Structure formats: structure tokens, C-alpha cells
Amino acid sequence: GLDSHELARLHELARHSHAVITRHQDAGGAYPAAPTFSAYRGYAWLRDGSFTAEGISRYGDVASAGRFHDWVDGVLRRRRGQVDDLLAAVDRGEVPSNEGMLPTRFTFDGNDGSDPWWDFQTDGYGMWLWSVVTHAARHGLDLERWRAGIDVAVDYLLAFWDRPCYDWWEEHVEHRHVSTLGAIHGGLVAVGTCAALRSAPWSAATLQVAARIRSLVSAEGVVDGHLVKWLGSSAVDGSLPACVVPFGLVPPDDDVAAMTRAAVAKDLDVDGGVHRFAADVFYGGGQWILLSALLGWNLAAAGDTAGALRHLRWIADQADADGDLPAQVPHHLLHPGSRAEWVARWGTVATPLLWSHGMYLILADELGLLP
Template sequence: MSEFSVEQLRALAVHSHAVIVANQHDGGAYPAAPTFSAYRGYAWLRDGSFTAEGISRYGDTTSAGRFHDWVNDVLGRRRDQVDDLLAAVARGKQPAVEQMLPTRFTFDGSNGSDPWWDFQTDGYGMWLWSVVTHAARHGLSLDPWRTGIEVAADYLFAFWDRPCYDWWEEHVEQRHVSTLGAIYGGLIAVAPELDEERRTTALKVAAEIRSLVAAEGISRGHLSKWLGSPHVDGSLPACVVPFGLVPMDDSLAGATLDAVARDLDVDGGVHRFTADVFYGGGQWILLSALLGWNLAARGDTDGAHRHLQWIARQALDNGDLPEQVPHHLLHPDSRDEWIARWGEVATPLLWSHGMYLILADELGIISRDNA
């Protein structure tokens, strides 16, 4: 199997940047996928935070900044809602799932009008990590985004340990290790930038997350899909890089990466989890990039390049990257059901392109002076 040259890999990075900025909404939101029926018209904090990181690494401070401006506005408009939620907690009440902040927003910052699996806290931690990382990389002040930062932090302080839907919008009854890792990473990143009271709370919550995961989120020597589960999930490497819940030099990090590779990696493409039936349970571009990112950080450059090459092979003739590919379906009998429900797999998926930019930058394929 022939490999892509550095020039070809760099050209895919240029295309990835172009896809993202061409589809960015005028208000700054990154649509999850511009044409896919279930995603069209919506932006997720989770997808957008990683997409913004890829754009920031590419060197496009304008596009990334517009996304962070949009999130700051969206969260600032929900200051009163968060205050009401905090007041309910102070009275000993547990707000209903329907009262919580959503995981996705319309481009104008409104809540969606159609039903969704909305209560997900990971994106709020991811955005804190993303905006702080972007500002630090480019020497920018966080002041323009401070309102949103404080809303996100206050929200997470109150609800970090509440069960919610995971990255894949499933199992609202569980506490998911990848969600806890994202919250940890966001709070650790932002803590130095907060006022004294919030900084103290952020560090306290981060320590509680680490203790909880150590006590209940490890199985057979590796991180588990949710607290008490024996299984792994393709999102778990994020608990190592970039969120740092587990340091790379900890044996738990190596065991987790090895378990994900053993159970979910086929020829460089990574599945979400073994029971995945969504579109038959294919291999996800963004998860291949996430594992490759971790391998690069561990010093396994060859392994990371293997994932970058696999991603490049999944690009359509025009360079667009899909959400997942069907080469090694875990549950092929379920694929047609999803096609009938929502159409063909989301393509292009901006998160896939953002993650390609991250891994390509990690491997020195692109320069941050492109934009």
C-alpha cells in the first residue's frame, strides 16, 4: 500500500482548513456537518472546541477567535439560567435534565427546537481547555471571553459529578470517564485565569475528579468507558492527551492507549466502542487522529504517522473527510437502518478535519504560519 507524501498530507491540511472556514457561520459557529440531516443547522461545543484547536494550530487566529467569540456570547446569554440552576441546588433541589444547558445550539445561539440528547457536560470543559490553549499559543488575552469562561466554570462546579449523556449522546444514567476527563482538563487549564474563589473551587473539583476516576474508573489496569464499566471507549485517550487527567508517564496512560488500540483499532482506524451500532459501527476519522495524537505525544512517531496515513486514505476525491467509514463494521446489519433514518454518513464532518489538522501539526506536517 503506497503512502501519501508530505506534500499530499500538507495539501489535505490546506483543504481541511478551507472546508472549516468555508462552512463557518457568519456569527462564528462551526456547523457539525453542513449537509447531514441530523446535524445541519447546529453547532456543538464538543466538535467546535476541537475544530477550533485545529484551526488555531494551523495559524488562523481570526477563525478560531470568531468561534470563541460566538461561544462567549452563547454562554453569556445563559448567565441567568445558570444562576437559577445554582440557586436550585443551594435549596437542595436537583434540576431536571430538561432544565440543564444544551450540548448543541443553533447558529444564532438558541436552543434547538427538536428533541435531542442534550444534557452533556463534556463540551463545557472542552471549550475552557480550547479557549485557554488558543490564547496561550498566540499570546492573546482571555478578557474578551471571560464572561463565557465564568459561566462555564460555575456550571461545571455544580454539575460535574452528575450522570449525563456521553460524547456519543448515549447512557444518560452513567458517569463517563471521558466526560470527567474533559471537565478536568478544562478546569485545570482555566484555573490560573480565574478569580481566587473560582480558582480554589476549580482545583478542588479537579482533585475530586481525579480521585473519583482512580477509585471507580479503572478496570483491568486501564481507564473504563464509565465508572464501574469493564469496557474501553475510543474517546478515552483524550483523558491523557490533551486533558491530562492521567499523565503520559503514568502506567495507566500506556495501559489505556494499549487497550483502545487492542480492542478498537483496525489498520489505523478506530471504532467508538465494541457495541456501537450507529451506521453499523464504523471507524471514526476523529478517533484515529486522537489515538495518533497520543502516540505522537508518547514518542511513537511511526504509530502516529500510521494513523495520519489511514486518515488521508479515507478522504474523498475532493479531499472531504467523513465522520466514519464502513470498512470494518462491527454490526453491519444495522447500517441500512441509519441510512434510511438520516441518509448517508455525515460528510464533510468539520470535527474530522479539525482533528486531522491537530495530528498533522503534531507531526510537523503543517506550519502555524499558513493563514
């Protein structure tokens, strides 16, 4: 579905995507989120990093992806005692506050980069489990390399999956977000169905909790046939297709999958560029490369190759003169009057955003376009 002109450009953007991710990977293995965006400089996220790692693993750079998993594993093993203490606190009936939870931002040396009172999230731990299992399966690797870190993440998620937290976008701490629940589900199903992990003490528990997540989403996370942004809401969020592919709450051909793709397209997709959510004022609420890629991936998986390609083309059209992909673009803004102040305070939008490049690699690979 691509001519020679398009193929050349898409192949080049794939090569550049691999290059810019690997050039910016920290010495210790972490992928930074956004090396030139002042507010994020020096920090790594498990969400961004796990999708980045999946793109790199699909591209075939086993060494780079493995170094990311090494970094995460080591960071998590260092939290073995913190997690054990949180679990013991729960067992005494003294549930920890958000201020005591595992962090969202990490420094490259594995310390808290931010205060979880203000940004407590559980999604990234679920994404990492999904990512590392998927990588090991793809490349025939022994998960014992990363197992002790996996154990920390699993124990943490089994205890805290049902807790309110901020969404992927750092909003609404009191709610339970369907794409967060979905990320956790994806990680738990990945480890619970992994033959290499068949004897883990938590093996059965992971699938039972994944079923509990699905029960909660069925009860409170589906309205008018589609997934919703958080339990008990009616609106959609652009992250929701991740609950289909890769996180697997429902198959791509499920009615809820189809209705969710359609709702996101109708409510949030403008000309191929997907918005996060209707109230988004962050930089005026622009169009996010990673969300267009996510929707495209989901369309490809459902057999809508043309729709996938349309989103791939839109993403490629957002690359700058160096091939770098921003977090978002302002071609359509949900709340235009809010943009300027973000630019004034934090500078221009993060470019490159490594996660944008990682998602581009995933979608390109789904469409058979990695050279």
C-alpha cells in the same frame, strides 16, 4: 517518516481542512458540525467546535478561531441567568431535572437546538474552557475578551461535574463517563493553572474539583490498569485517550496511559481505524476519523511517532475526491446488519465532518507537518 509523495498529499489535506472549516463557519462565528448532513444541518456543538477551533488555532488562523470563541462566549453570557437560577435551585435542595439543563445542540443564533432531556451532556463546556485557554496561550491573547462566558461555564461545571449524563455519543444518561469527566477535568485544570485567571474567584475551586474528578476516576474508572468507558464498567471506549492528551488525568508516560492506549488499540482499532465502543450499531459501528486522530495524537505525545504516523496515513486514505473527511467509514463494521437502516433514515454518513478536519489538523501539527 514521510516521503515526498506523502508529504505533498498530507500538506494538501491540511490546506483543504483549513479551507473547508473556514468556508463553512457561520457568519456569527459558530462552526457547524456537518453542513450537509440533514439531521445536523443548522446546529453547532461545543465538543466538535472546540476541537475544530484548536486545529484552526494550531494552523494559525487566529481570526477564525477567535470568532468561534466570540460566538461561544456570547452564547454563554446569555445563559448567565439560567445558570444562576440552576445554582440557586441546587442551593434550595431542588436539584434541576435534566430537562432544565444547558443544551447540547445550539442553533447558530445561540438557542437550544435540542431538548436536554434526550441529550444532556456536560463535556462540551469543559472542552470549550480547555480550547479557549489553549488558544489564548498560543497566540498571546487577553482572556478578558471571553472571561464573562468562561465564568458561566466554570460556575456550571463546578456545580454539575459529578452528575450522570449522556456520553459523547448520546448514550447511557444514568452513567458517569470517563471521557466526559476527563473533558471537564481538562477545562478546569486549564483555567485553574492559567496565570491570567489567577485572581478569578473560582481559581482554587477549579483545581480542587479537578482533584475530586481524578479521585472518582481512580476509585471507579480504572480496571486492569486501564481507564474504562464509564465508572463501574470494564470495557473501553475510543474516546478514552482524550483523558491522557489533551485533558491530562495522567501524563502520556503513565502506566494507565500506556495501558489505555493498548486497550483501545487491541479492542477498538482495526487497521488504523478506531471504533467508538463494542455495541456501537450507529451506521453499523464503523471506524471514526476523529478517534484515529485522537489515538494518533496520544501516540505522538508518548513518543510513538511511527504509530502516530500510521494513524495519520489511515485518516488521509479516507478523504474523498474533494479532500473531505467523513465522520466514519465502513471498511470494518462491528455490527454490519445495522448499517443499512441508518443510511435509509438519515442518509449517507456526514461528510465533511468539521471535527474530522479539526482533528486531522491537530495530529498533523503534532507531527510537524503543517506548512
